[PDB]
Amino acid sequence: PPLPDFPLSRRGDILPAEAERLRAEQPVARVRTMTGDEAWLVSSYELAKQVLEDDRFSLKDTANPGVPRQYALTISAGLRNAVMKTLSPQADRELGGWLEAQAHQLLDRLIEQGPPADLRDGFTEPYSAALHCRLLGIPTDDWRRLMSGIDVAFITSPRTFEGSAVNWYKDLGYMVDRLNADPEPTEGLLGRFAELRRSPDVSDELLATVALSLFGAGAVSTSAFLQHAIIALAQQPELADRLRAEPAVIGRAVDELLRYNLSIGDALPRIALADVRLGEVEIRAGELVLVLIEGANYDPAVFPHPERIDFDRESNPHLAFGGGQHFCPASALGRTHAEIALTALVEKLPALRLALPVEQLAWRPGFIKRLPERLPVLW
Amino acid sequence: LPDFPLSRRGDILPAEAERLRAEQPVARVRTMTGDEAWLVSSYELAKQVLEDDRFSLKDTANPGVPRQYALTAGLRNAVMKTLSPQADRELGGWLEAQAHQLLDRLIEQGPPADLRDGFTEPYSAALHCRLLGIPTDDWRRLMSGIDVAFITSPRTFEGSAVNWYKDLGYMVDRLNADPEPTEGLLGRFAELRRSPDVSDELLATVALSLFGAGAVSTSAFLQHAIIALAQQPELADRLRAEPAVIGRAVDELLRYNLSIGDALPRIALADVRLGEVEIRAGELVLVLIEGANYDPAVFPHPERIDFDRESNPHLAFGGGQHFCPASALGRTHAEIALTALVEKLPALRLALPVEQLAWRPGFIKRLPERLPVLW
Numbered sequence: 001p002p003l004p005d006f007p008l009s010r011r012g013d014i015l016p017a018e019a020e021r022l023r024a025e026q027p028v029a030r031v032r033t034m035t036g037d038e039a040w041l042v043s044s045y046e047l048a049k050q051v052l053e054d055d056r057f058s059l060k061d062t063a064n065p066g067v068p069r070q071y072a073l074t075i076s077a078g079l080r081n082a083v084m085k086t087l088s089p090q091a092d093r094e095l096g097g098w099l100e101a102q103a104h105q106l107l108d109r110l111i112e113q114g115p116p117a118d119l120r121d122g123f124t125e126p127y128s129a130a131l132h133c134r135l136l137g138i139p140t141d142d143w144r145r146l147m148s149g150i151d152v153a154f155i156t157s158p159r160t161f162e163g164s165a166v167n168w169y170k171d172l173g174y175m176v177d178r179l180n181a182d183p184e185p186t187e188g189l190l191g192r193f194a195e196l197r198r199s200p201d202v203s204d205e206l207l208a209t210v211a212l213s214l215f216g217a218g219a220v221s222t223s224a225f226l227q228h229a230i231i232a233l234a235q236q237p238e239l240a241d242r243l244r245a246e247p248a249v250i251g252r253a254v255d256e257l258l259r260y261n262l263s264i265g266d267a268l269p270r271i272a273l274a275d276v277r278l279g280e281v282e283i284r285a286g287e288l289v290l291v292l293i294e295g296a297n298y299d300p301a302v303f304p305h306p307e308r309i310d311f312d313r314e315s316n317p318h319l320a321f322g323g324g325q326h327f328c329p330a331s332a333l334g335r336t337h338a339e340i341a342l343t344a345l346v347e348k349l350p351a352l353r354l355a356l357p358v359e360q361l362a363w364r365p366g367f368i369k370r371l372p373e374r375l376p377v378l379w
Numbered sequence: 380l381p382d383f384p385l386s387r388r389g390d391i392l393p394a395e396a397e398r399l400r401a402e403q404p405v406a407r408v409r410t411m412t413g414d415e416a417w418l419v420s421s422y423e424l425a426k427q428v429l430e431d432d433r434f435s436l437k438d439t440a441n442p443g444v445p446r447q448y449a450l451t452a453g454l455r456n457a458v459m460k461t462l463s464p465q466a467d468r469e470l471g472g473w474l475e476a477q478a479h480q481l482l483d484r485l486i487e488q489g490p491p492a493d494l495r496d497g498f499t500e501p502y503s504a505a506l507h508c509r510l511l512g513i514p515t516d517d518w519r520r521l522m523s524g525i526d527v528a529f530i531t532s533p534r535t536f537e538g539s540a541v542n543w544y545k546d547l548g549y550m551v552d553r554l555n556a557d558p559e560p561t562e563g564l565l566g567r568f569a570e571l572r573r574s575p576d577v578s579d580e581l582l583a584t585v586a587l588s589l590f591g592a593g594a595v596s597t598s599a600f601l602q603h604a605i606i607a608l609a610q611q612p613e614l615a616d617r618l619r620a621e622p623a624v625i626g627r628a629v630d631e632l633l634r635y636n637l638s639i640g641d642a643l644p645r646i647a648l649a650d651v652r653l654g655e656v657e658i659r660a661g662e663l664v665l666v667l668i669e670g671a672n673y674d675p676a677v678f679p680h681p682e683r684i685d686f687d688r689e690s691n692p693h694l695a696f697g698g699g700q701h702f703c704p705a706s707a708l709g710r711t712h713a714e715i716a717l718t719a720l721v722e723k724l725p726a727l728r729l730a731l732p733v734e735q736l737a738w739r740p741g742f743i744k745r746l747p748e749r750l751p752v753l754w
């Protein structure tokens with residue numbers, strides 16, 4: 001038979017039809033990823049939340065040689081604490097007001113130049129960069145170069161491409177350099193890392209690998225989610241009116257946008273460490289399982305009228321940060337990051353709308369996120 | 380009815396235009412507005428429309444004529460003296476300076492880099508800022524308005540006018556700066572209104588639509604030039620071995636380039652027999668440059684970049700009355716860029732398979748969204 005292809009659609013302003021048809025007809029389906037390998041696409045909420053919590057489905061092993069891949073790869077010590085005190089909003093008391101300031105300078109720059117403007121280049125991208133620069137404790141001077149490296153880092157490619165490794169070691173280098181500076185870094189994950197290799201009980205390259213992969217994962221995540229948040233806010237201006245009128249609903253509203261957003265454009269991958277029956281399908285050890293977040297978060301068995309943005313849902317047990325052992329360790333930084341972004345957004349640009357019909361946004365191909373290459377708006 | 384636009388993928392000639400030219404060099408097509416149009420796709424018939432004044436360009440912007448996409452005095456002296464090769468004695472060395480900083484910046488950081496944001500875009504803005512005598516300070520804002528100005532839409536869209544009047548406003552400001560502008564088309568403009576024998580609106584209009592057309596035409600072309608050099612390294616080796624062949628190369632590259640994503644529009648004023656087709660007065664005629672510049676009747680083995688062609692009378696700069704008044708600048712801008720490129724990054728190559736470059740939709744030009752290269 002002909003197998004379904006994965007990924008589904010770079011267009012992210014409606015749920016792809018295919019996601020719905022899969023979850024309905026075959027919530028576990030053998031699909032053909034872009035590398036040519038075959039994997040199992042889990043597209044319903046019950047079975048998705050199962051794979052994320054069942055630890056016989058491993059993440060680490062997706063990086064092993066010769067296991068099947070959805071796309072080619074592009075890349076222990078008590079460091080955990082340094083990470084987790086970096087990822088608590090309660091370990092940077094100043095974070096919230098600073099981000100509020102960041103978001104307002106960016107927006108005031110745009111207001112002074114006047115509409116239209118690209119909200120990716122002029123807002124989501126410098127903003128997502130500034131937060132992660134603070135998280136690492138590096139200056140926001142090279143944010144364009146840094147976000148540019150992300151443009152290569154999270155390319156999704158059928159085969160391995162040179163330049164992914166050159167790009168890796170290029171920014172690996174930049175990180176190692178911020179870390180070994182002559183006024184040695186205090187402040188930030190890097191500041192926490194310097195203190196760490198002075199204590200008496202880990203390589204600089206390993207240290208930089210963490211700061212990099214962290215700066216990469218969160219910037220690309222929060223900038224993509226923020227653009228999808230914004231497109232929602234422009235297409236459905238009633239939602240902005242809701243926030244201007246009722247500032248307190250910002251968190252629940254971000255919570256729904258998280259569920260509704262189509263910024264994730266790969267699936268969450270796992271390798272089966274043992275035969276498991278999942279649904280009506282015997283999955284064999286060593287096969288690949290791809291957890292399709294939008295399939296789960298649009299599942300009508302758990303969320304009524306999933307196609308409709310709704311801030312007043314009784315219950316919202318969505319999977320936008322994943323589940324299980326590998327849940328996002330920055331869920332709240334993400335959440336905080338977006339709430340402040342958007343509260344500022346609706347105060348400053350209350351007339352916010354797209355500069356042209358939605359159908360004519362350019363959706364980026366070949367990337368880990370679905371995102372519009374430019375986000376032109378009016379206000 | 381066949382459909383126009385042809386393809387957003389600009390790394391080969393769209394197989395369709397080859398079928399069109401071979402079978403119907405003047406075929407009726409369906410534009411994205413849903414209007415109907417005559418697509419002229421062979422060299423001889425393309426040249427015919429471009430030199431037959433009865434095929435009008437101005438009347439393409441007329442109300443309620445058919446459209447391929449939504450619309451978005453003593454001045455001749457000021458313009459042509461700004462676009463003339465021998466009118467900025469230092470322009471050449473300054474461009475090479477720009478080219479060299481931009482490339483040196485990228486060598487400092489290391490590969491990979493994006494030659495669009497990092498090279499073609501600033502370079503093209505730098506040239507046109509100087510052309511207008513304004514600082515390059517806000518080139519990103521300037522270039523970002525190009526991103527909206529030259530969108531190709533089925534219907535009109537609120538945001539082409541706001542974007543126009545936003546950037547019109549910027550040019551008026553530069554013009555009316557209290558340290559009045561000396562130098563540049565703008566410095567040529569202040570002088571024009573202190574003469575004894577034309578409004579501030581129209582004056583910024585000209586300066587804007589010039590910065591518009593030139594920066595977008597030259598940045599998109601340049602990136603196609605680069606893609607060519609990266610994919611066919613032997614061509615770089617040639618420009619290093621024989622630097623003087625840069626002129627011929629920019630000419631072949633111009634013939635070969637696919638940056639132009641629309642066709643050139645005209646409105647027939649009277650009925651004309653063009654080819655075997657009777658075009659009625661008031662119908663729309665779209666000249667497809669890529670069809671003509673790849674016509675094998677005129678260019679032997681058109682698919683193959685050739686720096687050593689005996690003759691190369693291409694139409695990359697148009698033809699006829701409306702031939703690009705800046706061909707020479709264009710050529711100079713491209714020659715300097717590419718000389719600097721093969722000397723600075725001699726290993727220049729794409730970071731990833733060409734088939735994966737993201738080609739921009741819905742724009743007057745075909746361009747990669749990013750142009751990642753290694754060296």
Ligand code: HEM
Pocket residue numbers: 052059087135214215217218219221222225268269319320321322323325326327328329330331333334335
């Ligand atoms: C709104 C933005 C965000 C979204 C939508 C998001 C969502 C996710 C999801 C779904 C995963 C995949 C884990 C899995 O395979 O189950 C993940 C993991 C991860 N992301 Fe996020 N995240 C966001 C914010 C951030 C931020 C701000 C950072 C960086 C500081 C970050 C760091 C990480 C890390 C380190 C992991 C790996 C977790 C593990 O393997 O244990 N992300 N995030």
Ligand code: HEM
Pocket residue numbers: 429436589590592593594596597598600643644694695696697698700701702703704705706708709710
């Ligand atoms: C990369 C180089 C360039 C290319 C490929 C190019 C090519 C063309 C083409 C094909 C046309 C259309 C002619 C027609 O409709 O018949 C044109 C005209 C024009 N372009 Fe370019 N050009 C380039 C650079 C420039 C520059 C640097 C400027 C000026 C700043 C410029 C300004 C214009 C103007 C004003 C026209 C209209 C001519 C008229 O209506 O009389 N372009 N160009």
Ligand SMILES: Nc1ncnc2[nH]cnc12
Pocket residue numbers: 217218221264266267268368
């Ligand atoms: N590879 C990935 N896929 C989806 N969401 C992510 N968030 C962080 N990394 C991710």
Ligand SMILES: Nc1ncnc2[nH]cnc12
Pocket residue numbers: 592593596639641642643743
């Ligand atoms: N609208 C346009 N179409 C094609 N080539 C151009 N060069 C400058 N403007 C152009």
